[PDB]
Amino acid sequence: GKLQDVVNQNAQALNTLVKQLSSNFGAISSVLNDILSRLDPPEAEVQID
């Protein structure tokens, strides 16, 4: 179990980082490509940041 925890804690922290890419973070869309295709570039910079 000592060696099982090192593999488990490294893999679960990696899957958390992938799961953060699907978060909106207060924006309209979590995916980046739908922000550009639906919002105008002069005011898209607020939604990107």
Partner 1 sequence: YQPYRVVVLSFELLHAPATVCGPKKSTNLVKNKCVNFNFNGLTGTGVLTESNKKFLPFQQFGRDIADTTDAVRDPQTLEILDITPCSFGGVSVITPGTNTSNQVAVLYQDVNCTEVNVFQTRAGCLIGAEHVNNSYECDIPIGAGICASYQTSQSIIAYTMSLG
The contact set with partner 1 (CB under 8 A) reads 15, 18-19, 22, 33
Q: After which residues is the chain broken (C to N over 2.5 A)?
A: none
Nearer to partner 1, 15 or 42 (CB): 15
Tell me whether residue 30 or residue 44 sits nearer to partner 1 (CB atom).
30
Q: Which is nearer to partner 1, 33 or 42 (CB)?
A: 33
Q: How far is the CB of 37 from partner 1 (least distance, A)?
A: 9
